[PDB]
Amino acid sequence: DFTLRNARMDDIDQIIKINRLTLPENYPYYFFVEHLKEYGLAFFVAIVDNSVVGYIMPRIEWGFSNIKQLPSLVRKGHVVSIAVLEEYRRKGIATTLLEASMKSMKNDYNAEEIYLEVRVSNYPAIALYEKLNFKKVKVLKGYYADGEDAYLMARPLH
Numbered sequence: 302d303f304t305l306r307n308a309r310m311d312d313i314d315q316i317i318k319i320n321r322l323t324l325p326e327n328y329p330y331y332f333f334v335e336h337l338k339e340y341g342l343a344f345f346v347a348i349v350d351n352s353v354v355g356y357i358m359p360r361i362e363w364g365f366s367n368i369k370q371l372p373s374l375v376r377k378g379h380v381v382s383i384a385v386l387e388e389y390r391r392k393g394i395a396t397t398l399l400e401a402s403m404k405s406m407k408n409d410y411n412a413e414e415i416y417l418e419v420r421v422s423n424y425p426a427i428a429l430y431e432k433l434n435f436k437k438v439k440v441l442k443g444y445y446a447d448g449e450d451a452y453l454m455a456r457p458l459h
């Protein structure tokens with residue numbers, strides 16, 4: 302009962318409201334637009350009833366590796382943001398978004414790994430990443446503004 306496709310500039314508003322509704326980290330419009338162009342092949346939306354109800358926003362970076370079994374310097378895919386509207390959760394959306402984005406990160410921008418930051422209290426997110434074989438590879442102490450820690454979580458791509 303849903304549909305995956307690459308993000309397009311007319312989704313930006315839907316993407317923004319979802320961001321505003323779901324998350325405390327509320328980037329200005331131009332931030333989504335810029336990533337959408339730079340890394341659009343790996344930028345996906347989830348669609349139900351011709352509405353956007355979930356999105357994933359990537360950045361591709363180059364720098365030091367997060368993971369033991371990778372080389373020192375690497376191309377890495379950074380999940381900057383991912384949200385699904387509360388009404389539509391547990392229906393497999395965030396798993397699919399991550400999978401599409403990873404496949405793209407790998408085959409479109411040559412990522413060797415994909416990492417992210419997640420609040421240590423965000424149990425259902427942590428559960429989703431571990432299920433897709435992300436591992437906790439660092440605890441960022443007092444990472445968020447309120448002072449909450451994050452786990453940096455990461456996973457190689459071959």
Ligand SMILES: CC(C)(COP(=O)(O)OP(=O)(O)OC[C@H]1O[C@@H](n2cnc3c(N)ncnc32)[C@H](O)[C@@H]1OP(=O)(O)O)[C@@H](O)C(=O)NCCC(=O)NCCS
Nearest residue numbers: 383384385390391392393394395396419425426428429432
């Ligand atoms: C809710 C959220 C964590 C996952 O979205 P989702 O669409 O439900 O993801 P999925 O349906 O693909 O869930 C797949 C797995 O993630 C875990 N998971 C997802 N929602 C969960 C929930 N309420 N409770 C416990 N585990 C959950 C589970 O391990 C699930 O596996 P399973 O259903 O086979 O048992 C998150 O992506 C979201 O939409 N909103 C929360 C926003 C947030 O706090 N952080 C997002 C960026 S850090």
